[PDB]
Write a structure and sequence with these properties.
The complex is a heterodimer. By secondary structure, chain A is mainly beta. Chain A is about 0% helix and about 50% strand. The N and C termini of chain A lie far apart (about 65 Å). In chain B, strands 2, 4, 5, 6, 9, 10 and 11 form a seven-stranded mixed beta sheet that branches. In chain B, strands 12, 13, 16, 17 and 18 form a five-stranded antiparallel beta sheet that branches. The interface between A and B is large, with 49 and 44 residues.
Chain lengths: ~210, ~230
């Protein structure tokens, strides 16, 4: 079985930069190494076959070089739609193997997060527990931490979704704090705390209480 | 253009067989120079090649998966199916069917179908719509939230609609494992502020195997007459 090493495993680059991915094989595979593009939640898309032959419909900004054991995929000027994870695949001997993958994130400018607290839906008031929501959107970069607190003490029963890329290049997420219905109805004040590099003093809070 | 879509159940119990069939449309399965193959990808993991089949019936399998893998061809239905026996949780992944082209390999992929391998019983999703935060009404666009929680397995689909017509400008978070072993996610639909304040009615659609008819709807509107 042939091992495929890909580097770098992750990289962030700006628009117009040259991107370089390394694919190394444990043995010689001549010029049988295909390149694929997989966007999040989508199937992979063939970009380059052989080592330098461009698949129909692929823009010319994609280019591949290499022969034998050392190969390289190159994008000349990165475009916003080129955000995806790229794989190399050897095509010489079975079993066919893919590279470890190289996630290409887009480099851009920091943005202040907007934080919004959402009370539970009326439908949920039938249950013994209710969900408190905290939407954090419009922030960059994706490095963020979100905590809940009440009366100065941390709340434990909360879950936070991973950052999700929005259509404008920023990120958003939701945090769900699950509390007992009795605690909510009595008017206890809960706070969603967000720490991010683009915030003033790297910290902000939003409160949420029953109206 | 040739298209590949895959079918089969998305939840199998451990120590059972996994069955998937890939239907080829817009092209012929029984043409040399093509290798109809199966590739799986566990969530957050990489791509693993399973094996291919030739239209004559000849098969090449990945050695790690041999004695458990059976790929076949039905030329009379333009189909090639995959069987995977004695299954564990290590087989929970997104399974793709693809064809290996004349040049290189894998010029046409399927949409992907996720199969979860577990002994747990399916949970029906609870769907809740949340209006935009009051603080957000100062912006030019507002966010409508559709919370889907308490469902199992994680394979789920969420769409937005208004007046019978699809609303496109939405994003959905990946499923997140909750503390009780079920999953939840939220879909954020972004609309112009004016549409929200005028009382436009938006609908969140959720499709999941544990729902009656695999489908449910929840509405969300600013109802000013209240």
């Amino acid at each position: 079985d042939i091992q495929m090493t890909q580097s770098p495993s992750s990289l962030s680059a700006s628009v117009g930069d040259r991107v370089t991915i390394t694919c190394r094989a444990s043995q010689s595979i001549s010029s049988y190494l295909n390149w694929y593009q997989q966007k999040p939640g989508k199937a992979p898309k063939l970009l380059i076959y052989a080592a330098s032959s461009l698949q129909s419909g692929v823009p010319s900004r994609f280019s591949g070089s290499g022969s034998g054991t050392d190969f390289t995929l190159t994008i000349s000027s990165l475009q916003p739609e080129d955000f995806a994870t790229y794989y190399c695949q050897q095509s010489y001997s079975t079993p066919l193997t893919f590279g470890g993958g190289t996630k290409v994130e887009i480099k851009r400018q920091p943005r202040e997060p907007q934080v919004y607290t959402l009370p539970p839906s009326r439908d949920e008031l039938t249950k013994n527990q209710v969900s408190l929501w905290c939407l954090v959107k419009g922030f960059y970069p994706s490095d963020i931490a979100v905590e809940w607190e009440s009366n100065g003490q941390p709340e434990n029963n909360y879950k936070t979704t991973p950052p999700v890329l929005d259509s404008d290049g920023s990120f958003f997420l939701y945090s769900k704090l699950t509390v007992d219905k009795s605690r909510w109805q009595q008017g206890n004040v809960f706070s969603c705390s967000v720490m991010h590099e683009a915030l003033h003093n790297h910290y902000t809070q939003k409160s949420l209480s029953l109206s | 253009q040739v298209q590949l879509q895959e079918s089969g159940p998305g939840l199998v119990k451990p120590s059972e067989t996994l069955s998937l069939t890939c239907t080829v449309s817009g092209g012929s399965v029984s043409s040399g120079s093509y290798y109809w193959s199966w590739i799986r990808q566990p969530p957050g993991k990489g791509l693993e090649w399973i094996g291919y089949i030739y239209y004559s019936g000849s098969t090449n399998y990945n050695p790690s998966l041999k004695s458990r893998v059976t790929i076949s061809v039905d030329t009379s239905k333009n189909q090639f199916s995959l069987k995977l026996s004695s299954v564990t949780a290590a087989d929970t992944a997104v399974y793709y069917c693809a064809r290996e082209g004349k040049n290189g390999a894998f010029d046409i992929w399927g949409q992907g179908t996720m199969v979860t391998v577990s002994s747990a019983q399916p949970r029906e999703p609870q769907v809740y719509t949340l209006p935009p935060s009051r603080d957000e009404l100062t912006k030019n666009q507002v966010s409508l939230s559709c919370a889907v929680k308490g469902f199992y397995p994680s394979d789920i689909a969420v769409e937005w609609e208004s007046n019978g017509q699809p609303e496109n400008n939405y994003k959905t978070t990946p499923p997140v494992l909750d503390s009780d072993g079920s999953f939840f996610l939220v879909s954020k639909l972004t609309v112009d502020k004016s549409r929200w304040q005028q009382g436009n009615v938006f609908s969140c659609s959720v499709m999941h195997e544990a729902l009656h008819n695999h489908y449910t709807q929840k509405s969300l509107s600013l109802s000013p007459g209240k």
